[PDB]
Paper text:
While the composition of MT nucleation systems is to some extent heterogeneous across eukaryotic organisms, γ-tubulin, a member of the tubulin superfamily, is a universal determinant in this process. In Saccharomyces cerevisiae, [name] 97 (Spc97) and [name] were identified to assemble with two molecules of yeast γ-tubulin ([name]) into the 300-kDa heterotetrameric γ-tubulin small complex (γ-[name]), forming the core of the MT nucleation system in lower eukaryotes. The γ-[name] possesses a Y-like overall shape of 180 Å height and a width of 60-100 Å. It is composed of two interacting spokes, each comprising one copy of γ-tubulin and either one molecule of Spc97 or [name]. The N-terminal GRIP1 domain mediates canonical interactions between the Spc subunits, while the C-terminal GRIP2 domain binds one copy of γ-tubulin.
We isolated recombinantly expressed [name] γ-[name] from insect cells by affinity purification and anion-exchange chromatography and used cryo-EM single particle analysis to obtain a structure at near-atomic resolution. We thus divided the γ-[name] into two individual segments, each comprising one Spc protein and one γ-tubulin molecule, and refined them separately. This approach increased global resolution to 3.6 Å and improved density quality towards the periphery of the complex. Visual inspection of overlap, cross-correlation between density segments, and root mean square deviation (R.M.S.D) of protein backbone atoms in the atomic models consistently indicate that both copies of γ-tubulin in our cryo-EM reconstruction adopt a ‘straight’ conformation, as typically observed for αβ-tubulin dimers in stable and ordered microtubules. Thus, γ-tubulins in the fungal γ-[name] are in a conformation that can promote growth of ‘straight’ microtubule protofilaments without a conformational change. Our cryo-EM density of the [name] γ-[name] indicates binding of GDP, rather than GTP, and it remains to be addressed whether a nucleotide exchange to GTP is required to promote microtubule nucleation activity as suggested by analysis of γ-tubulin mutants in S. cerevisiae. In [name], the first cluster of interactions is mostly formed by hydrophobic interactions between the GRIP1 domains of Spc97 and [name]. In particular, the long insertion in the [name] GRIP2 domain (Asn626-Leu656) is involved in extending the interface and bridges over the subunit interface to stably bind to the GRIP2 domain of Spc97. Similar as for the interface between the Spc97/98 GRIP1 domains, this interaction is stabilized by hydrophobic patches: Leu630, Leu631, Leu632, Phe636, Met637, and Leu639 of the [name] insertion are exposed to a hydrophobic binding pocket on the surface of Spc97. In [name], the γ-tubulin arrangement strongly differs from MT symmetry, requiring γ-tubulin molecules to move 5 Å towards each other during activation.
Numbering used by the authors:
A (entry chain B): 2 to 52, 71 to 121, 127 to 203, 209 to 243, 260 to 310, 319 to 428, 437 to 471
B (entry chain C): 91 to 110, 132 to 235, 265 to 336, 354 to 530, 575 to 693, 737 to 802, 812 to 871
C (entry chain D): 150 to 627, 630 to 638, 647 to 679, 687 to 726, 733 to 785
D (entry chain A): 2 to 41, 71 to 121, 127 to 203, 209 to 243, 260 to 310, 319 to 428, 437 to 472
Write the structure that this text describes.
């Protein structure tokens, strides 16, 4: 039950991370000031009707003080100071000592800036480890291309490994760019570091994000899924107490760490069948892709047993599974927060499928098309990092292409 | 010569005459004297054997009355002892007149009533006779035998009606407690009504009197206590007493007030039960809900179920699941409410969460067939109807009241298919093109006219069923419910036995007038509704045959341009003409079957035969 | 002579009238003849019946008996005192013959014959066969028989009802004579071996027969276990006053007055019993908290003791369990969400059976200490050993789940820090090898996570709502009544119920979990799972010798050779038979798909489990 | 059944829709403030087919109020302050040419307006259109309004119209021939109302309440549940046997249930122009005034079978509809509304042909050659419906 440190880097992760921490505030009763709200009595125990004392666990994402204020354990890092001021002034409970101010429009400028001030970033992370009593999970919120989060966010995930020995679970929560000159080769350079210094990755397409909700609305859609995977963590249930228990139940191979998400929008029988539709997935799908693992979230409280079981049995036949993986559809019965209204019923599905073939080959097709068309000792190290990144993303592509055929038994 | 016979009438020896003579003089007067005192010990021997705990309780009170006579017997033996020792000087003449004037009138009757019990001991609305040990029934009936055998004697019957008064005084106390309260306290089997709600109050026909033999009065005494237990099982109230009193009949089981007081207790047992059903359990609120669930008083609920499950009801029972049809029926009819302790659901929201929509494997056209001597056909409804409303609206009622639901949902499904087929035969895109040949356009125009006369048949058959039969017969039931209910509220129809008969008559005529009673009537109702359904599913399959008769429509919806277009149109007009002569075939026999049974039995059915025979020939 | 007849009626020998000790007739010949003595025989029977009955009251004149029969002797003496009063005045006036004395005593033979037949049935089985014998005659004809039956019953029932009234207003038992049906068994184990009702000792005149059982039993429970010495004193001073001051006793009360009293008294105590199980004892608040700790409804706490106790649980049972388990329990409370809620002092831990000495992972348990809390509440061993066995089965599943996800966290850093930088040519047989060990973990972490998800929601959570929540706060089957139809008792939403029904709702709720479907031609279903859990226990234990080899494999390539090629080939040979040994335990988990699915299809309950386990 | 959406187009349609919704709110007791009235839950009437249920218990009708001018819109919003302000759409149109161009450019913003009314209904069953067949703003965009909803929803949603025909500006023969083409091939059911004949029934405000009496009584078994005719699809399926003669007329009765069925069949009480010899195709009688003694209805139906003229190929049946009275309104008397389709709609169509053929012979850039094509195509579109009415009357219908 170790706590979780979140790292917001880049222009995306600041406004997405603002929606991530505003979602955790109303879910746990704390306000923008930081003071705690008296916990309402759950309706799982009634009293003699004539006719403090908290059941949730917010310490994994907030720290405690003597005056009962809750401060989130997030690290903010960007180039421009304008994006930090809109996030700090909106939610005043952010720790101002976690705020770091330096723009970078390329991966080379981002990774070089990550080398020059290693000492002020590694010391900032180690101050948050002193606040917690147990650390088990690091979290990221970065863009794959575009802003400075591709460059210096690629370095911040590398300084976790050399300092702590890479024994902490890294969830990257990456946002892939939509379909721009810098955008093709920005993606292929950070993805080599993404598949080398991580443990799990939740991919999110921006071009497939406006299809679901129909830029402020695009930020609220990422925070709904990012806070849904932490619902059995903060609200303790029978299973899925820690983040390593969810991901290890989902990732079979350390080269297969790429997860696709989907939001359901009612009852809970049609909610399980609505999540299996291919139009709700944040990742784009092409043909019929075989599924490896899947986890259905029902974080709105469901007193509908024997109805969830009929939906699991129906969703086993309508989903084609990989042959060496057993057909097991797992569902968590997450509990509704007593501060939010009990009327709405949410549903999230995170899953591992073969749909990442179309995502990676879309970048690799545009990678060689631009370096052949357009193309001090700086050209040599750029060229060898292209070929090192070219052969490395192919390794997880042929791993997905061989995953559909029955293998891994010799 | 006199002292020795003074002890012989006490059942004892006199040393000369007999046990407990050859010197026969002119003593003729003692020939009958020792005969009168011989059976004196017959009463005393009758006491010591029949006073046991067995042989019923009503013979124990009679055993006390004969022993009271034993003291009244010995009361006069002091006077003859005073007559003996004193100086009377009157012997051999007056001794007969003294001991038989006040004793022999009661000594003779008390011996024949006792010797008959020992005779019948050596022999040994409902049922279970075969009485044992001649305890209560055989003793009370031979007393009335003794009165009618001595008609013409005023000085002899007055003792028998007093003997029957005190003996049967204990039998009235349990009979008065049964009729007034309902307590059946009887330690032995010493009563008429024997508690064993149908096979529970057997009346024991072995031991009734001659007065309690009429088949109409046996139900006046059996249903008086049964309808009182229903008032005692529901609200509690052991030994009511209702802050009131009652006349509490006491006199005898021989009076002109016997037939009047039993009916007086029978009207009170029905006034208190009907006040429980109408005011307590809201019986007017039940018969308006049975009309909304079985006979479709408000068809908004059932029309939202049929169109939602329209694709599921067309397919057979094998190509459908039971759970999918029942589940959709719950969201549209029922409403999930919480049974928190403290609230009180009425009869409206209890019977609404009680029905079950079964689709078990029979047919509508065989349930009615076995009663007398696709999934829309086998769909039905069942309501549990809890206590005590399962007593008046029994299973004989609901079986004649559920059959009308399967018929009303079958024709409402045919009227749903024809109303949907009108949508696609008139304003579709495949069915209504613009520039096809006139040989096809005449076949489309002939198919619409045939369907416009088929759709008007079920819209006229329904206007007779849902209005002339169901609604018209309910106007007299609903009238004699509310104006029953206004009279019941004043007191603290007037019979529960006729309320079951008034509702069984309502469901029978609804089953009679809706063509589900006769052999040739049901044989045409099954054939006519099946042919309409065989024409309705014929329409949906022409929609894929009309795509090959138009060259422009097949080019947009993708063997073409040969003689097979004229060949398959000839096969289309062949199977369409076979259904046109078949529509006129069954309808002229359907119009003939209503003319046959509409003149002899039902006058209301002739009203359809006057309306439908003037429509379709025109 | 006629004056010797009263001398024999009192049992005194004259010069010619003689008799014997007992069971002999008054054979007196030679008075006049057989004509005078034959009628004298039936009045001689009046005298022998007096003497044979006078020796019964003499030998049992309040002595040699301590039972209810000593009140019937007072009845037998009262009619015998009135018998000798009648012989005096009937011989005070001068009788002419012996027929006139026969007339006045003839109304008395009906009374004398009944007292002898019940006195002959003495010194036999004299328990309830005597009190029911008198009550069997109270509903009878022949009002002289009925007249003596009621006066012999109304003053013999007063010692019997003295046991009943103490059972209503005081809640005790003054019984010593093998009598009134609430007996106390000497094995005082729980509140079930104590007070019980026998149906055979139920009399025919007690009309309630079930409410007086549930009035005295709850009075003992409200006096000694849940003392509260203010309500019982108010209850004893109130209802015993209205039973004595206006109705002079319970025997003087009729049948309708008893049922009106007891029913108004039966619901009076159950209002107070259901008062303190809910408002003060909080039965449902503790049964819900019984599930958070015994049934693993808060997995953050059970994950905390498995992380903050990974050093104590590795040793044997030599732990003191006074300063070690107290340290591990208290710091894990600060880690998880248990540190904030109310009843944290009730939480304690202990080691079960330290004399075995198997391991430290197996002997641990959690205890919800319900001390006071004035309620037992019939939570004895047979309600607790099956309630601690279910925790230890659920302890085996969360233990394997916490060393399988750490197995995922240990092999990912083994891949990163070592395997991706091994000579760029030996990675391809190693990256293929490590992808099988991470994938066979995925087959194991999916078998447990759905086995718990079936137990924790279909078995545990559905039975708690059905048996505990519905029977307490919701209605039974069970009504419809407009109460406006006829002419300080707070009614509340608890569905008032007695002691024998509060133990049964909780007793069945544990019985419907431990015995429901699979927790109990083949071995049992619970035994089949333990064989699969043993393989997972053995899979992780044989995976560490793989993990300790690859970290050494990285040490050979950094510093490097003929003797090195011998040492490298022996180390890769350690990887060949290892992955073959990994295939052995893989087919045993593939054997799990064969025998379980051949057993789950035989039941309709486990048909849904056959496609997701 | 299914929920119902209506469309009020034009100046004449907005005045009819004002009286149509005030009468629908009166029958259900709904006040003119959006507030509900308790029943004199637990409601037998179903106002959910026409009104929207909200969380704040406000009652807003399902109506679109498209119009060119903001004058009559202020009349409807002030008198009935419960219309949704987003559903109403605003900006002079006197001809059909300038009125059709308003709906063609604004087709996307108006199609998007009605998609907000589809998702608010669970199961939609029919559309309605209240407009005038002669007029610039009504027949201009309303002809485009029924066209855009025909191909999108595609034969699953019924489209009924309640049009008002001109009784007599000199441009009124130009537009009545154009929109009569679109009312034939694109409308499912069509009601004919004459402004001149409606004044005779009462003996412009007086004629509006008579149309509101008929347009609300046709859906009386739809809202108030009964034994039969629970849906609108089962009501129109009797009156229209073939789609090429879907034009319908109506009749208004204003004391006995036997005498009410005889007064409805008279030609004096008609909303449309009636010729000399008219033969009926199908008839529907609405007895909505709480008729309970069904002994006089049985005589009124049997009398109407062998008295009124009949078309030979159709089955002559007089369907009577028992309608329950509104409990919020007081019981005045028995009310009767007879809706039917007959041969009596030839005389007004050839009157439009007479004013059209006379005007083309009189002849009263790039816009001339197209409107003569549209005048030509609309002529045999309504000439073919004249030959359809003349064919079904005779014996020549039942042969090749």
């Amino acid at each position: 039950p170790g706590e979780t440190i979140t790292l917001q880097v880049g222009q995306c992760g600041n406004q997405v991370g603002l929606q991530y921490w505003q979602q955790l505030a109303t879910e746990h009763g704390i306000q923008s000031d930081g003071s705690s709200t008296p916990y309402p009595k759950d309706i799982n125990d009634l009293q003699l009707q004539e006719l403090k004392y908290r059941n949730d666990h917010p310490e994994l994402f907030f720290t405690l003080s003597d005056s009962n204020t809750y401060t989130p354990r997030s690290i903010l890092i960007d180039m421009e100071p304008s994006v930090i001021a809109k996030s700090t002034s909106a939610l005043p409970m952010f720790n101002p000592r976690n705020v770091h101010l330096s723009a970078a429009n390329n991966w080379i400028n981002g990774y070089k800036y990550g080398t020059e001030e290693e000492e002020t970033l590694l010391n900032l992370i180690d101050r948050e480890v002193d606040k917690c009593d147990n650390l088990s999970n690091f979290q990221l919120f970065h863009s794959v291309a575009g802003g400075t989060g591709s460059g210096v966010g690629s370095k911040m995930l590398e300084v976790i490994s050399d300092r702590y020995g890479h024994k902490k679970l890294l969830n990257t929560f990456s946002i892939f760019p939509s379909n721009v000159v810098v955008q093709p080769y920005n993606t292929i350079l950070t993805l080599k570091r993404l598949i080398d210094y991580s443990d799990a990755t939740f991919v999110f397409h921006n071009d497939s994000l406006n299809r679901i909700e129909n830029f402020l609305g695009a930020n609220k859609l990422i925070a709904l899924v990012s806070a849904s995977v932490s619902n059995p963590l903060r609200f303790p249930g029978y299973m899925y107490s820690s983040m390593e228990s969810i991901v290890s139940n989902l990732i079979p191979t350390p080269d297969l760490k790429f997860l696709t998400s989907s939001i359901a929008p009612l009852n809970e029988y049609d909610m399980l069948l609505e999540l299996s539709n291919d139009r709700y997935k944040t990742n784009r799908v092409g043909g019929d892709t075989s599924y490896i693992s899947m986890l259905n979230y029902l974080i709105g409280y469901n007193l509908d047993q024997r109805e969830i079981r009929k939906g699991i049995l129906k969703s086993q036949q309508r989903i084609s599974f990989v042959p060496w993986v057993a057909r097991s559809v797992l569902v968590v019965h997450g509990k509704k927060s007593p501060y939010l209204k009990n009327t709405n019923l949410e549903g999230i599905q995170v899953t591992n499928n073969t749909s990442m073939i179309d995502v990676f080959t879309k970048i690799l097709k545009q990678f060689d098309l631009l370096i052949k068309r357009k193309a001090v000792e700086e050209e040599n190290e750029v060229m060898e990092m292209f070929n090192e990144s070219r052969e490395s993303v192919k390794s997880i592509i042929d791993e997905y292409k061989a995953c559909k055929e029955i293998t891994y038994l010799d | 010569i006199i002292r020795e016979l003074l002890f012989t009438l006490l059942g004892h020896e006199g040393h000369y005459i007999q046990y407990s003579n050859l010197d026969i003089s002119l003593k003729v007067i003692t020939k009958k004297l020792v005969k009168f005192g011989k059976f004196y010990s017959g009463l005393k021997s009758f006491i010591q054997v029949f006073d046991n705990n067995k042989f019923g309780k009503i013979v124990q009170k009679f055993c006390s009355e004969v022993r009271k006579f034993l003291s009244s017997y010995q009361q006069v033996l002091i006077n003859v002892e005073h007559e003996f020792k004193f100086n009377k000087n009157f012997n051999l003449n007056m001794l007969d007149s003294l001991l038989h004037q006040e004793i022999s009138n009661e000594m003779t009757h008390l011996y024949q009533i006792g010797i008959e019990i020992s005779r019948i001991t050596e022999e040994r609305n409902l049922y279970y006779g075969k009485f044992d040990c001649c305890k209560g029934g055989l003793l009370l009936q031979v007393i009335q035998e003794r009165m009618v055998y001595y008609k013409g004697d005023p000085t002899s019957l007055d003792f028998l009606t007093q003997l029957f008064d005190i003996v049967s005084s204990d039998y009235i106390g349990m009979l008065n407690q049964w009729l007034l309260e309902g307590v059946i306290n009887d330690p032995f089997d010493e009563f008429m009504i024997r508690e064993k709600w149908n096979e529970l109050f057997l009346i024991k026909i072995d031991g009734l009197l001659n007065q309690f033999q009429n088949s109409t009065i046996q139900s006046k005494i059996l249903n008086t206590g049964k309808y009182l237990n229903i008032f005692k099982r529901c609200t509690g109230l052991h030994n009511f007493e209702s802050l009131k009193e009652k006349l509490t009949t006491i006199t005898s089981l021989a009076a002109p007030d016997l037939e009047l007081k039993i009916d007086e207790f029978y009207h009170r047992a029905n006034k208190m039960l009907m006040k429980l059903l109408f005011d307590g359990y809201n019986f007017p609120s039940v018969v308006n809900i049975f009309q909304r669930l079985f006979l479709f008083a408000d068809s908004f609920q059932i029309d939202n179920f049929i169109d939602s499950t329209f694709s599921e009801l067309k397919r057979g029972k094998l190509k459908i699941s039971v759970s999918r049809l029942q589940k959709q029926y719950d969201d549209i009819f029922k409403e999930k409410i919480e049974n928190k302790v403290g609230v009180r659901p009425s009869v409206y929201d209890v019977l609404k969460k009680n029905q079950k929509l079964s689709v078990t494997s029979e047919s509508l056209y065989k349930v009615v067939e076995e009663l007398m001597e696709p999934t829309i056909t086998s769909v039905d409804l069942t309501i549990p109807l809890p206590f005590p409303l399962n007593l008046v609206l029994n299973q004989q009622l609901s079986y004649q009241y559920e059959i009308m639901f399967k018929l009303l949902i079958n024709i409402k499904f045919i009227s749903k298919y024809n109303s949907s087929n009108w949508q696609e035969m008139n304003y579709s895109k495949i069915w209504t093109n613009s520039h096809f040949n006139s040989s096809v356009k005449k076949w489309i125009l002939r198919c619409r006219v045939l369907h416009s006369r088929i759709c008007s048949f079920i819209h006229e058959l329904e206007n007779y069923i849902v209005h002339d039969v169901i609604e018209h017969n309910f106007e007299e039931i609903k009238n004699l419910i509310h104006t029953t209910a206004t009279n019941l509220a004043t007191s603290e129809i007037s019979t529960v036995e006729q309320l079951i008969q008034k509702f069984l008559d309502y469901s029978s005529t609804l089953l009679n007038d809706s063509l589900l009673t006769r052999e040739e009537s049901l044989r045409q109702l099954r054939k006519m509704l099946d042919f309409i359904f065989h024409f309705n599913n014929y329409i949906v399959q022409v929609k894929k045959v009309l795509v090959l008769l138009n060259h422009e429509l097949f080019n947009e919806y993708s063997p073409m341009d040969q003689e097979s277009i004229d060949k398959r149109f000839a096969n289309l007009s062949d199977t369409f003409l076979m259904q046109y002569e078949k529509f006129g075939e069954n309808l002229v026999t359907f119009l003939a079957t209503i003319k046959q049974v509409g003149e002899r039995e039902n006058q209301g059915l002739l009203e359809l035969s006057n309306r439908l025979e003037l429509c379709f020939p025109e | 002579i006629l004056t010797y007849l009263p001398y024999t009626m009192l049992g005194s020998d004259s010069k010619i009238f003689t008799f014997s000790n007992n069971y002999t007739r008054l054979e007196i010949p030679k008075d006049i003849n057989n004509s005078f003595s034959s009628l004298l025989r039936e009045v001689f029977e009046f005298a022998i019946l007096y003497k044979q009955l006078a020796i019964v009251v003499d030998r049992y004149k309040g002595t040699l008996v301590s039972a209810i029969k000593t009140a019937y002797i007072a009845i037998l003496e009262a009619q015998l005192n009135k018998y000798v009063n009648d012989i005096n005045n009937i011989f005070n006036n001068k009788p002419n013959s012996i027929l006139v004395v026969y007339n006045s005593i003839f109304p008395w033979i009906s009374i004398l014959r009944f007292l002898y037949r019940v006195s002959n049935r003495l010194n036999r089985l004299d328990g309830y066969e005597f009190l029911t014998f008198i009550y069997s005659f109270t509903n009878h004809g022949d009002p002289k028989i009925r007249g003596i039956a009621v006066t012999a019953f109304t003053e013999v029932v007063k010692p019997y009802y003295n046991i009943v009234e103490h059972w209503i207003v005081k809640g005790e038992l003054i019984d010593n004579n093998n009598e009134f049906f609430i007996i106390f068994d000497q094995e005082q184990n729980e509140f079930n071996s104590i007070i019980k009702l026998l149906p055979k000792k139920i009399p025919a005149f007690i009309k309630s027969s079930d409410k007086i059982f549930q009035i005295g039993k709850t009075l003992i429970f409200l006096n000694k276990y849940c003392r509260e010495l203010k309500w019982v004193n108010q209850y004893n001073v109130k209802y015993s006053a209205i039973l004595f001051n206006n109705h002079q006793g319970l025997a003087s009360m009729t049948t309708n007055e008893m049922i009106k009293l007891i029913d108004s008294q039966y619901n009076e105590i159950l209002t107070f019993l259901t008062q303190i199980i809910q408002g003060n004892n909080k039965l449902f608040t503790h049964v819900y908290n019984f599930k958070r700790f015994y049934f693993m409804e808060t997995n953050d706490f059970i994950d905390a003791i498995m992380v903050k106790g990974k050093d104590v649980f590795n040793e044997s049972s030599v732990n003191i369990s006074s300063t070690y388990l107290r340290k591990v329990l208290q710091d894990a409370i600060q880690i998880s969400s248990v540190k904030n809620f109310e009843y944290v002092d009730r939480l304690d831990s202990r080691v079960l059976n330290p004399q075995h000495g198997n391991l430290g992972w197996e002997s641990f348990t959690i205890e919800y200490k319900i001390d006071d809390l004035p309620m037992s509440y019939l939570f004895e061993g047979h309600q607790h050993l099956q309630y601690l066995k279910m925790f230890h089965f659920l302890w085996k599943l969360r233990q394997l789940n916490n060393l399988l996800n750490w197995h995922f966290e240990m092999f990912n850093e083994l891949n990163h820090n070592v395997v991706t930088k091994l000579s760029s040519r030996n990675r391809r047989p190693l990256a293929k090898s490590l992808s099988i060990i991470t994938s066979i973990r995925f087959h194991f972490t999916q078998f447990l996570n759905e086995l718990i998800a079936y137990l924790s929601y279909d078995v545990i959570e559905e039975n708690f709502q059905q048996h505990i929540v519905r029977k307490l706060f919701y209605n039974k089957n069970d009504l419809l009544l407009n109460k406006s139809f006829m002419n300080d008792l707070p009614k509340f939403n608890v569905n008032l119920l007695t002691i024998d029904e509060l133990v049964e709702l909780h007793g069945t709720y544990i019985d419907s979990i431990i015995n429901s479907s699979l927790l109990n031609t083949n071995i049992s279903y619970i035994d089949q799972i333990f064989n699969i859990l043993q393989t997972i226990f053995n899979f992780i234990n044989t995976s560490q010798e793989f993990y300790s080899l690859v970290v050494t494999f990285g040490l050979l390539v950094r510093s490097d050779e003929l003797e090195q090629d011998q040492e490298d080939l022996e180390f890769q040979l350690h990887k060949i038979k290892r992955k073959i040994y990994k295939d052995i335990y893989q087919h045993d988990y593939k054997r799990q798909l064969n025998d379980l699915k051949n057993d789950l299809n035989r039941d309709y309950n486990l048909k849904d489990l056959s496609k997701l386990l």
